[PDB]
Amino acid sequence: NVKGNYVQVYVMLPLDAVSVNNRFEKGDELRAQLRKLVEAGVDGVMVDVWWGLVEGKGPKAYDWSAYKQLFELVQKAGLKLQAIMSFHQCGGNVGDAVNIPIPQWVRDVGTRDPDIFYTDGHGTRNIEYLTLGVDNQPLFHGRSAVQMYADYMTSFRENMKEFLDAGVIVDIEVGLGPAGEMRYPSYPQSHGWSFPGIGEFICYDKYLQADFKAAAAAVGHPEWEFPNDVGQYNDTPERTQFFRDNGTYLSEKGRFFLAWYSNNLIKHGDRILDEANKVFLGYKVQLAIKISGIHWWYKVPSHAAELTAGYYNLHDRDGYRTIARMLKRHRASINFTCAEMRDSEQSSQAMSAPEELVQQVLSAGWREGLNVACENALPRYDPTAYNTILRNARPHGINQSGPPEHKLFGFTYLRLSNQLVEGQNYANFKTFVDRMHANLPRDPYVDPMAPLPRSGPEISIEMILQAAQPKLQPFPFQEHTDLPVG
Ligand SMILES: *[C@H]1O[C@H]1CO[C@H]1O[C@H](CO)[C@@H](O)[C@H](O)[C@H]1O
User: Fold this and answer.
1) Where are the beta strands (DSSP E) in 393-486?
2) For residue 137, what are the CA distances in angstroms to 128, 132, 182, 419?
3) Closest by CA position to 360, among listed 395, 398, 412
4) Mutate to test the pocket of ligand 1, among 90, 296, 340 (most ligand atoms within 8 A of CB)
5) Distance (Å) from CA 253 to ligand 1 centroid
6) Most buried of 122, 246, 324, 466 (most Cβ within 10 A)?
């Protein structure tokens, strides 16, 4: 009985499944595409629920019309639904096809208070997302950012209650930064970063500067400042005193700064997830966050690009198990990426190790008792990609008589298009879905969710950081799947 081996497959919808005008105007095309996904046995779809579309008029002027039409279409297809609370701009990150900013009235606050945006050491403001520094600052016609997020999720729940109760909506992914990912905007590909640059620390907004000053003073170092030996976006580690082998990242001051920077990201997730949990209490959903896959520089001691993204990950410090430990009280899932990547596919100069990074994140999640899901990072249609995903989905292969020791809770494919669902691309995709399902038919009843319980007791940052060390080896992963596409 191989049923416990089944891994759900979801497909991301187009970025503008709902138009830039908050209208559902491509429904017939989408319906036709969904028929192809259903022919393939897909479990469900994932979609961005864009803040700038729904709350675009003004505070609390929520317009759910288009999303309700979309969700009805997905329900009528027999598909489940993962909804992303997309508190970010579409545009400016890799693959973005369509341009959907955060609400204009939110951005208007930035005219008198430009520090509502993550800011780099050059002073450049990133307008894609609100700095975590204003999470609890009542700057937006009386509301804080966290209040805005909570109110949006409340309105979503109220409006979408019938889809929750019908078992259509089964996952809520809480967007926590740029591109929905819990990270800083350290690699701005349209404003002066190119892969595989180390990126920059994006902590110069006045709210984060004041928080650092306060943190430094609390430990008797009021004079400490952010590191200034960090180079710039397109450097490599050895170009800098901070990130070079044996560099100043290892120093007392460096460690304190990196802990501060990465801890703030963890705190940002914890506080928003607590609100999300209160909103969705009692519904049969799971709450998820998305962690970005910063595979470049993983092979060098400084893990420089992870560090600037906000993941304080080193040979001897597990910067993902800390995040996982924070998720535990919420019973939140990790959704990761890079599931399709092999190390041999990466350029040498990127010092890139996606396989090992994936193994680390999955292992960290599993050690904290979490459900772990994953996406592909880049568009792929070929058997090798699918076989890499399959390996990651069941790292120990098939258990012939029960559930395997570890498995992904789900996989989400980026992304639906007409190209996916024709020709050879479609044939490859269908076979992949069969293999993910352990060659079983689609099971509409799989992985049932209990009513969401309230988050457990808040734990301190010190408690969360006990997960950082000792760093543990990953669980063993097979080199190749035992159930390839063929
Ligand atoms: C950052 O794995 C990357 C995913 O980001 C892209 O897809 C997301 C889901 O559709 C979307 O929210 C994001 O804006 C886009 O860049």
Assistant:
1) 410-413
2) 18, 10, 19, 45
3) 395
4) 90
5) 34
6) 324
Best probe residue, ligand 1, of 88, 311, 334, 414 (max atoms within 8 Å of C-beta): 414
Q: Is the dihedral of CA 124, 125, 129, 133 positive or negative?
A: positive
Closest protein CA for atom 4 of ligand 1: 179
**SS3 letters for 38-72?**
HHCCCCEEEEEEEHHHHCCCCCCCCCCHHHHHHHH
| Packing angle, helices 354-367 and 321-328, rounded to 10 | 30
Site of tokens 């995040």: 323
Dist. CA 368–CA 320, nearest whole Å: 11
Residue type present at position 338: C
* Cβ atoms of 305 and 198 closer than 8 Å: yes
| Nearest residue to 369 via CA among 318, 330, 315 | 330
What radius of gyration, in Å, describes the C-alpha atoms of the chain? 22
Report resolution in angstroms: 1.2
Q: How far is the CA of 294 from the centre of ligand 1 (A)?
A: 14
How many angstroms separate the CA atoms of 37 and 421, rounded?
8
Q: Indicate the burial class of 226 (C-beta count within 10 angstroms; 0-12, 13-18, 19 or more).
A: middle
**Do the beta carbons of residue 389 and residue 438 sit within 8 Å?**
no
Nearest residue (CA) to ligand 1, atom 14: 179
Distance CA 44, CA 56 (A): 28
Where are the domains positioned within the chain? 1-486
Experimental method: X-ray
48 annotated binding-site participant: yes
Considering only CA atoms, which of 295, 363, 294, 291 is closest in space to residue 323?
A: 291
Neighbours of 445 (CB within 10 A): 6
> Residue 180, class by beta-carbon neighbours within 10 Å (0-12 exposed, 13-18 middle, 19+ buried)?
buried
How far is Cα 83 from Cα 64, in angstroms, rounded to an integer? 13
**What residues contact residue 123 under an 8 Å CB cut-off, 6+ apart?**
204
Are residues 334 and 289 in contact, defined by beta-carbon separation less than 8 angstroms?
Answer: yes
Domain range 1-486, CATH architecture: Alpha-Beta Barrel (3.20)
Residue 415 annotated as lining a ligand binding site:
yes
Name residue 34's amino acid: L
Tokens of 69: 């039409």
Residues with active-site annotation: 181, 375
